[PDB]
Amino acid sequence: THRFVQKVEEMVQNHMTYSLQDVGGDANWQLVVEEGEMKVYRREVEENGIVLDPLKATHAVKGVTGHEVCNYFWNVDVRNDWETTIENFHVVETLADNAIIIYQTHKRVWPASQRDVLYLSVIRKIPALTENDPETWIVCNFSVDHDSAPLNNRCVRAKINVAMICQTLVSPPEGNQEISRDNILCKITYVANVNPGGWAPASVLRAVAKREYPKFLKRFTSYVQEKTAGKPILF
Ligand SMILES: O=S(=O)(CCO)c1ccc(-c2ccc(C3CCCC3)c([C@@H]3C[C@@H]3c3ccccn3)c2)cc1
């Protein structure tokens, strides 16, 4: 269908295999911020003196489904309503109705150079592995090469592997009556592995992540709740 079908399958399954695991009981993850059901963890990792710190967060969001949260996360048309760190983005290629390649630049984090990034963004529904398990909706954004990447002399090229992974729990339907948003809960696992791609001072990157990831999770999840309130549910 397109040349990244196989790569998308591998990235998506790697997340299904490894990113969903619980880390509440795992001392290898440091719990760095908690704000109610929002739990943000990371591991301190450097390669060549450059911070890579794997970031993993869980959250539980009332009144929205995983399909909704993934649609709003993936849909480039609403990106600017919730995103606060992007300076410019351009859709570089459409691969399928569920997969695009995006070029974007991020607001500079002083005193490091601005970063840019070039990634495939894909949204998939992953069927329940057994009839006992929840279905999953996942967006994965992972860096790829491309010939129509911009020359941007201000920016160092970061590389990312991010996933927003959602499972949705509902009260079952009571005969012929729909499920209300009061009875739905979206369990989120969000993972972000970011390679700044060059020099950046470690303590500043760490302080910035510790502040901006929870701000992002809070703003984005509230944004989905606000936009879906009183709209029919899209399961
Ligand atoms: O969830 S997504 O796919 C949403 C689509 O954009 C995504 C999230 C985060 C990034 C990201 C890119 C660059 C940087 C750093 C690297 C060196 C200097 C800039 C960071 C650091 C961690 C801080 C950060 C955290 C959360 C949101 C934005 N910024 C994060 C990219 C994509």
Coordinates of N, CA, C and O in Angstrom, one line a residue, residues 53-152:
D53 N 16.7 10.5 28.2 CA 15.6 10.1 29.1 C 14.3 9.6 28.6 O 13.4 10.5 28.4
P54 N 14.1 8.3 28.4 CA 12.8 7.7 28.2 C 11.7 8.3 29.1 O 12.0 8.4 30.4
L55 N 10.6 8.8 28.6 CA 9.5 9.4 29.4 C 8.4 8.4 29.2 O 8.1 8.0 28.1
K56 N 7.7 8.1 30.3 CA 6.5 7.3 30.2 C 5.5 7.8 31.2 O 5.8 8.1 32.4
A57 N 4.2 8.1 30.8 CA 3.2 8.6 31.7 C 2.0 7.8 31.6 O 1.6 7.3 30.5
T58 N 1.2 7.7 32.7 CA -0.2 7.2 32.6 C -1.2 8.3 33.0 O -0.8 9.2 33.7
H59 N -2.4 8.2 32.5 CA -3.4 9.1 32.9 C -4.7 8.4 32.8 O -4.8 7.3 32.1
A60 N -5.8 8.9 33.4 CA -7.1 8.2 33.2 C -8.0 9.4 33.0 O -8.1 10.3 33.9
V61 N -8.7 9.5 31.9 CA -9.5 10.7 31.6 C -11.0 10.3 31.5 O -11.4 9.5 30.6
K62 N -11.8 10.9 32.3 CA -13.2 10.7 32.3 C -13.9 11.3 31.1 O -13.6 12.4 30.6
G63 N -14.9 10.5 30.5 CA -15.8 11.1 29.6 C -15.4 11.3 28.1 O -16.1 11.9 27.3
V64 N -14.3 10.6 27.7 CA -13.8 10.6 26.4 C -13.4 9.2 26.0 O -13.0 8.4 26.9
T65 N -13.4 8.8 24.8 CA -12.9 7.5 24.4 C -11.5 7.6 23.8 O -11.0 8.7 23.4
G66 N -10.8 6.4 23.7 CA -9.5 6.3 23.1 C -9.5 6.7 21.7 O -8.6 7.4 21.2
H67 N -10.6 6.4 21.0 CA -10.7 6.8 19.6 C -10.7 8.3 19.5 O -10.0 8.9 18.7
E68 N -11.5 8.9 20.4 CA -11.5 10.4 20.3 C -10.2 11.0 20.6 O -9.7 11.9 20.0
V69 N -9.5 10.6 21.7 CA -8.3 11.2 22.2 C -7.3 11.0 21.0 O -6.5 11.9 20.7
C70 N -7.2 9.8 20.4 CA -6.3 9.5 19.3 C -6.6 10.4 18.1 O -5.6 11.0 17.5
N71 N -7.9 10.5 17.7 CA -8.2 11.5 16.6 C -7.7 12.9 16.9 O -7.1 13.5 16.0
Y72 N -7.9 13.4 18.1 CA -7.5 14.8 18.4 C -6.0 14.9 18.4 O -5.4 15.9 18.0
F73 N -5.3 13.8 18.9 CA -3.9 13.9 18.9 C -3.2 13.9 17.5 O -2.1 14.5 17.3
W74 N -3.8 13.1 16.6 CA -3.3 12.9 15.3 C -3.7 14.0 14.3 O -2.9 14.3 13.4
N75 N -4.9 14.5 14.5 CA -5.4 15.4 13.5 C -4.7 16.7 13.4 O -4.8 17.6 14.3
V76 N -3.8 16.9 12.3 CA -3.0 18.1 12.2 C -3.9 19.4 12.2 O -3.4 20.5 12.7
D77 N -5.1 19.4 11.7 CA -6.0 20.5 11.7 C -6.3 21.1 13.0 O -6.7 22.3 13.1
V78 N -6.1 20.3 14.1 CA -6.5 21.0 15.4 C -5.2 21.2 16.3 O -5.3 21.6 17.5
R79 N -4.1 20.8 15.7 CA -2.9 20.8 16.5 C -2.7 22.1 17.3 O -2.4 22.1 18.5
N80 N -2.8 23.2 16.6 CA -2.6 24.5 17.2 C -3.5 24.9 18.4 O -3.2 25.7 19.2
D81 N -4.6 24.2 18.5 CA -5.5 24.5 19.6 C -5.0 23.9 20.9 O -5.3 24.4 21.9
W82 N -4.1 22.9 20.8 CA -3.6 22.4 22.1 C -2.1 22.4 22.3 O -1.6 22.5 23.4
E83 N -1.4 22.4 21.1 CA 0.1 22.3 21.1 C 0.7 23.7 21.5 O 0.2 24.7 21.0
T84 N 1.7 23.7 22.4 CA 2.2 25.0 22.7 C 3.7 25.1 22.4 O 4.3 26.2 22.7
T85 N 4.4 24.1 21.8 CA 5.8 24.3 21.7 C 6.3 24.3 20.2 O 7.4 24.4 19.9
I86 N 5.3 24.3 19.2 CA 5.7 24.1 17.8 C 5.8 25.5 17.3 O 4.9 26.3 17.6
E87 N 6.8 25.8 16.5 CA 6.8 27.1 15.8 C 6.2 27.0 14.4 O 5.5 27.9 14.1
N88 N 6.6 26.0 13.6 CA 6.1 25.9 12.3 C 5.9 24.4 12.0 O 6.6 23.6 12.6
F89 N 4.9 24.0 11.2 CA 4.9 22.6 10.7 C 4.4 22.5 9.3 O 3.7 23.5 8.9
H90 N 4.8 21.5 8.6 CA 4.4 21.4 7.2 C 4.1 19.9 7.0 O 5.0 19.0 7.4
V91 N 3.0 19.5 6.4 CA 2.8 18.1 6.0 C 3.6 17.8 4.8 O 3.5 18.5 3.7
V92 N 4.6 16.9 4.9 CA 5.5 16.7 3.9 C 5.0 15.6 2.8 O 5.3 15.7 1.6
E93 N 4.2 14.7 3.3 CA 3.7 13.6 2.4 C 2.5 13.0 3.1 O 2.5 12.7 4.3
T94 N 1.5 12.6 2.3 CA 0.4 11.8 2.8 C 0.6 10.4 2.3 O 0.9 10.2 1.1
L95 N 0.6 9.4 3.3 CA 0.9 8.1 2.9 C -0.4 7.3 2.8 O -0.6 6.4 1.9
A96 N -1.3 7.6 3.7 CA -2.6 6.9 3.7 C -3.6 7.7 4.5 O -3.2 8.7 5.1
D97 N -4.9 7.4 4.5 CA -5.8 8.3 5.3 C -5.4 8.2 6.8 O -5.9 9.0 7.5
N98 N -4.5 7.3 7.2 CA -4.2 7.2 8.6 C -2.7 7.5 8.9 O -2.3 7.3 10.0
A99 N -2.0 8.0 7.9 CA -0.5 8.1 8.0 C 0.0 9.2 7.2 O -0.2 9.3 5.9
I100 N 0.7 10.2 7.8 CA 1.3 11.3 7.1 C 2.8 11.4 7.6 O 3.2 10.8 8.6
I101 N 3.6 12.2 6.9 CA 4.9 12.6 7.3 C 4.9 14.1 7.5 O 4.4 14.9 6.6
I102 N 5.4 14.5 8.7 CA 5.4 15.9 9.1 C 6.8 16.4 9.4 O 7.6 15.7 10.0
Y103 N 7.0 17.7 9.0 CA 8.2 18.4 9.4 C 7.8 19.5 10.4 O 6.8 20.2 10.1
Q104 N 8.4 19.6 11.6 CA 8.0 20.7 12.4 C 9.3 21.3 13.1 O 10.3 20.5 13.2
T105 N 9.2 22.5 13.5 CA 10.2 23.2 14.3 C 9.6 23.5 15.7 O 8.5 23.7 15.8
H106 N 10.5 23.4 16.7 CA 10.1 23.6 18.1 C 10.6 24.9 18.6 O 11.7 25.4 18.1
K107 N 9.9 25.6 19.5 CA 10.4 26.7 20.1 C 11.7 26.4 20.8 O 12.0 25.4 21.3
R108 N 12.6 27.4 20.7 CA 14.0 27.2 21.1 C 14.0 27.0 22.7 O 13.2 27.6 23.4
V109 N 14.8 26.0 23.2 CA 15.0 25.9 24.6 C 16.4 26.4 24.9 O 17.4 25.8 24.7
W110 N 16.5 27.7 25.4 CA 17.8 28.3 25.7 C 18.6 27.5 26.7 O 18.0 27.0 27.7
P111 N 19.9 27.4 26.6 CA 20.7 28.1 25.6 C 21.1 27.1 24.3 O 22.0 27.4 23.6
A112 N 20.4 26.0 24.2 CA 20.6 25.1 23.1 C 20.0 25.7 21.8 O 19.1 26.5 21.8
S113 N 20.5 25.2 20.7 CA 19.9 25.6 19.4 C 18.5 25.1 19.3 O 18.1 24.1 19.9
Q114 N 17.8 25.8 18.4 CA 16.4 25.3 18.1 C 16.5 23.9 17.6 O 17.5 23.6 16.9
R115 N 15.4 23.1 17.8 CA 15.3 21.8 17.2 C 14.2 21.7 16.1 O 13.1 22.3 16.3
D116 N 14.4 20.8 15.1 CA 13.4 20.4 14.2 C 13.2 18.9 14.2 O 14.0 18.3 14.8
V117 N 12.2 18.4 13.5 CA 12.0 17.0 13.6 C 11.2 16.6 12.3 O 10.5 17.5 11.8
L118 N 11.4 15.4 11.9 CA 10.7 14.9 10.6 C 10.3 13.5 10.9 O 11.1 12.6 11.1
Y119 N 8.9 13.3 11.0 CA 8.4 12.1 11.6 C 7.2 11.6 10.8 O 6.4 12.4 10.2
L120 N 7.0 10.3 10.8 CA 5.8 9.7 10.4 C 4.8 9.7 11.6 O 5.2 9.3 12.7
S121 N 3.6 10.1 11.3 CA 2.5 10.1 12.3 C 1.4 9.1 11.8 O 0.8 9.4 10.7
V122 N 1.1 8.1 12.6 CA 0.1 7.1 12.1 C -0.9 6.8 13.3 O -0.5 6.7 14.4
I123 N -2.1 6.6 12.9 CA -3.2 6.3 13.9 C -3.8 4.9 13.5 O -4.2 4.7 12.4
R124 N -3.8 4.0 14.5 CA -4.3 2.6 14.2 C -5.2 2.1 15.4 O -4.9 2.5 16.6
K125 N -6.1 1.3 15.1 CA -6.9 0.6 16.1 C -6.4 -0.9 16.2 O -6.2 -1.6 15.1
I126 N -6.0 -1.3 17.4 CA -5.4 -2.6 17.5 C -6.4 -3.5 18.2 O -6.7 -3.2 19.3
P127 N -6.8 -4.6 17.5 CA -7.8 -5.5 18.1 C -7.3 -6.1 19.4 O -6.2 -6.3 19.5
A128 N -8.3 -6.4 20.3 CA -8.0 -7.1 21.5 C -7.3 -8.4 21.3 O -7.7 -9.2 20.4
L129 N -6.2 -8.7 22.0 CA -5.4 -9.8 21.8 C -6.2 -11.1 22.1 O -6.1 -12.1 21.5
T130 N -7.1 -11.0 23.2 CA -8.1 -12.0 23.5 C -9.4 -11.4 23.8 O -9.4 -10.1 24.1
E131 N -10.5 -12.1 23.7 CA -11.9 -11.5 23.9 C -12.0 -10.9 25.3 O -13.0 -10.4 25.7
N132 N -11.0 -11.2 26.2 CA -11.0 -10.7 27.5 C -10.3 -9.3 27.6 O -10.3 -8.7 28.7
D133 N -9.8 -8.8 26.6 CA -8.9 -7.6 26.7 C -9.5 -6.4 26.0 O -10.4 -6.6 25.2
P134 N -9.0 -5.2 26.3 CA -9.6 -4.1 25.7 C -9.0 -3.9 24.3 O -7.9 -4.3 24.0
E135 N -9.8 -3.4 23.3 CA -9.2 -2.8 22.1 C -8.3 -1.6 22.4 O -8.4 -1.1 23.5
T136 N -7.4 -1.3 21.5 CA -6.5 -0.2 21.7 C -6.5 0.7 20.6 O -6.4 0.3 19.4
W137 N -6.4 2.0 20.8 CA -6.2 3.0 19.8 C -4.9 3.6 20.1 O -4.6 3.9 21.3
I138 N -4.0 3.7 19.1 CA -2.6 4.2 19.2 C -2.3 5.2 18.2 O -2.6 5.0 17.0
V139 N -1.6 6.3 18.6 CA -1.0 7.2 17.6 C 0.5 6.9 17.8 O 1.0 7.1 19.0
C140 N 1.3 6.7 16.8 CA 2.8 6.7 16.9 C 3.4 7.7 16.0 O 3.0 7.7 14.8
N141 N 4.3 8.5 16.6 CA 5.0 9.5 15.8 C 6.4 9.1 15.9 O 7.0 9.1 17.0
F142 N 7.1 8.7 14.8 CA 8.4 8.3 14.8 C 9.3 8.8 13.6 O 8.8 8.9 12.5
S143 N 10.5 9.3 14.0 CA 11.3 10.0 12.9 C 11.6 9.1 11.8 O 11.8 7.8 11.9
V144 N 11.6 9.7 10.6 CA 12.0 9.0 9.3 C 12.8 9.9 8.5 O 12.8 11.1 8.7
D145 N 13.6 9.4 7.5 CA 14.3 10.3 6.6 C 13.3 10.6 5.4 O 12.4 9.8 5.1
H146 N 13.6 11.7 4.8 CA 12.8 12.0 3.6 C 13.6 13.0 2.7 O 14.2 13.9 3.3
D147 N 13.6 12.9 1.4 CA 14.2 13.9 0.5 C 13.6 15.3 0.5 O 14.3 16.2 0.2
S148 N 12.4 15.5 0.9 CA 11.9 16.9 0.9 C 11.8 17.5 2.3 O 10.9 18.3 2.7
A149 N 12.8 17.1 3.1 CA 13.1 17.8 4.4 C 13.7 19.1 4.0 O 14.6 19.2 3.2
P150 N 13.2 20.2 4.6 CA 13.7 21.6 4.5 C 15.2 21.8 4.9 O 15.5 21.1 5.9
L151 N 16.0 22.6 4.2 CA 17.2 23.1 4.8 C 16.7 24.2 5.9 O 15.9 25.1 5.6
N152 N 17.2 24.0 7.2 CA 16.8 25.0 8.2 C 18.0 25.1 9.0 O 18.3 24.3 10.0

